[PDB]
Design an enzyme around this catalytic site. Sequence first.
Site, PDB file in Angstrom:
ATOM      1  N   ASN A   1     -42.431  25.777 -26.844  1.00 60.38           N
ATOM      2  CA  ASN A   1     -41.474  24.935 -26.127  1.00 60.38           C
ATOM      3  C   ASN A   1     -40.531  24.324 -27.159  1.00 60.38           C
ATOM      4  OD1 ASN A   1     -40.045  23.021 -24.681  1.00 60.38           O
ATOM      5  ND2 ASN A   1     -41.837  22.155 -23.632  1.00 60.38           N
TER       6      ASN A   1
ATOM      7  N   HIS B   1     -36.426  27.401 -18.245  1.00 61.14           N
ATOM      8  CA  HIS B   1     -36.866  26.710 -19.444  1.00 61.14           C
ATOM      9  C   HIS B   1     -38.349  26.980 -19.675  1.00 61.14           C
ATOM     10  CE1 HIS B   1     -37.917  23.710 -22.348  1.00 61.14           C
ATOM     11  NE2 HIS B   1     -38.508  22.921 -21.468  1.00 61.14           N
TER      12      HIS B   1
END
Lengths: 327, 327
Positions: free
Chosen positions: B284, B254
């Site tokens: 993000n 991630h």
Amino acid sequence: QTRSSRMAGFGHAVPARCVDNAEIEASLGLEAGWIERRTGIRSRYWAEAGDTLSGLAERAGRMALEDAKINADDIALTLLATSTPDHLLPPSAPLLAHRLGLTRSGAIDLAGACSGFLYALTLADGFVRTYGRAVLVVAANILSRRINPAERASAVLFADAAGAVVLTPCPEVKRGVLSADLVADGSGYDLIQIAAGGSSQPFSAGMIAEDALMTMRDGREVFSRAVALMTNTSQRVLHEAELTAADISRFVPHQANARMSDAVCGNLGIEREKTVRTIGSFGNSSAATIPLSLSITNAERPLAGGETLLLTAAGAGMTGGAVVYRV
Amino acid sequence: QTRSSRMAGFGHAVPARCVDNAEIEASLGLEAGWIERRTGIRSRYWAEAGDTLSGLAERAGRMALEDAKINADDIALTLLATSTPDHLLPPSAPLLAHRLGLTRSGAIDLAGACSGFLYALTLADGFVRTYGRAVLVVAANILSRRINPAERASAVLFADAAGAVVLTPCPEVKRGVLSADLVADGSGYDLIQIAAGGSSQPFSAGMIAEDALMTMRDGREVFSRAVALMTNTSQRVLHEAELTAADISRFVPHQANARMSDAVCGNLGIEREKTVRTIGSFGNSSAATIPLSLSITNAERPLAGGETLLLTAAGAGMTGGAVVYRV
Ligand SMILES: CC(C)(COP(=O)(O)OP(=O)(O)OC[C@H]1O[C@@H](n2cnc3c(N)ncnc32)[C@H](O)[C@@H]1OP(=O)(O)O)[C@@H](O)C(=O)NCCC(=O)NCCS
Ligand SMILES: CC(C)(COP(=O)(O)OP(=O)(O)OC[C@H]1O[C@@H](n2cnc3c(N)ncnc32)[C@H](O)[C@@H]1OP(=O)(O)O)[C@@H](O)C(=O)NCCC(=O)NCCS
């Protein structure tokens, strides 16, 4: 060596406020018996000040964990099917797992209106079978805080509840989930909808109150679509399990509306007397209705090995699904 | 006959507004280079007015379907991992499947912050292997409409994107998803939160505008908790797959923060050169980062049979997960 899953424990929970039809009929200027005649509901439970979704889920989940006599380490995954999580971030499932002391459990929320429980049940079954570990499946909703009190079609139906099932891994075949069918029809997306609060219209200071609340734009179109989805999904899971309606021990439809429950029963040729009916006391709590009914009917008559259950639901989206489960 | 799933196609999409670090730094009265120093982001994509989550997800989904050269009838299930659905009701997944022409596909939203894509991927792999049918997994978010512009810790990181993967049934063993580990830690539930909007504080006229936007209450504590969860899940999927980090062809974490990506690599003994890093241009975007990075890395260099992928994420919840996938 895991070939199937079984519903090892059941639970359900409601808030404490019991709301009779008469209270709602006064607010909407309707005569007595209006609601029960049109929906089959006589009362419903509504959350009270502070009441949280996760606290409601927790009580149903704890009841189901205790019913299964399962140690809390054995829960590898927690699936919480809800439309009304405590917060828009984070999801409610990790808090639910934490409150139940499930220290080895993953957790995620499933948003399927509703059809959410049947989606969660199917994916949990695939998890149980793939990984050989137990899954807690909770469906819960506080729809009362989303009700537009002036919209009669919704204000008389929706209710708050949680139901939970513990799925454990089983070594034997030709039992558990025999068949499953999950459908969606986004052509009906706008029929049941909240205008504001998603990314399409974020909530802003000075916005129309009712834009945060549910609306049902065409109650009759929804009825017809929902009946078709529950009928067609049920027929084809029956066909895939090589069963007929006459082989179903208990029919557990989503508790949308007693008239809708009846329509599906007719379409499938299923006796009213084999159909679990909990809408009378618990109203329509979206994804919670099926696991709450499973908890109810299991309490009334414990589910016996060899019984076959037919579960079906349809919801906003539109969504729909059916599952043939054999104890 | 199905014993594994394969990622048969990849796709990603972003909105058109490119936001350089300089524009956000001016906003926050920050010196030049401040954001890149601390996060490795150089720029990010934000939604414009009128853009929709489902439209963004549809562009990624369609690129993935086309890359898979897969007939739309083959998609039996659409999983949309999002925190930012178009509407609070219904879920966005049925609309997405409808706009992509997937007339045989079910559809449900997963809300796992971020970890959402790894939960989606794990459960979809279970669906593929259980029913022998293809699944479309999309992750998408428009976090920009939820950013608190005054909160430096979150306003410099979050971004809008979608990523998509077509999972198709595969007959052979010892490939596909080799191991998965899904975790939750609700003791950190309050660390990353939106106050208003769920059932705990429903949106109302006159409420504090701030309460509708994300807050990260303790960035340092988030950093440590997420690094631990990604590290620990990653180690145990490697151990379960009986692989070392040295066997991993591409590491796809991630994209929370380049410093966080560096810390996870460092704990696990993984070369920066093996790590897919898209945070510099895409920011993000929560659950979208991993499938967006998978599509990017596959475009730069096609995934070759035999390659082993290590995926890991952590997020609000707390949630986290790791997956080992062999092409
Ligand atoms: C039947 C359903 C409409 C529920 O709503 P309801 O209880 O019937 O409430 P309604 O007000 O719409 O019922 C019709 C009533 O409005 C009246 N009405 C509506 N339009 C009218 C018109 N143009 N002229 C006269 N009367 C009208 C009906 O005649 C009847 O009231 P009345 O006989 O006193 O005049 C149905 O949509 C439902 O149950 N949906 C389920 C909710 C859900 O989403 N569940 C999830 C799974 S579907
Ligand atoms: C690193 C993280 C803290 C956020 O990024 P960040 O930009 O470094 O956040 P910060 O603003 O706190 O960084 C330190 C800065 O804050 C300043 N700061 C904050 N509070 C301060 C205070 N009370 N006094 C002085 N300075 C303060 C530091 O001095 C430093 O600012 P400066 O260099 O201009 O003087 C971390 O929480 C993160 O990146 N989390 C990931 C986001 C996420 O949720 N991803 C999903 C997976 S976790």
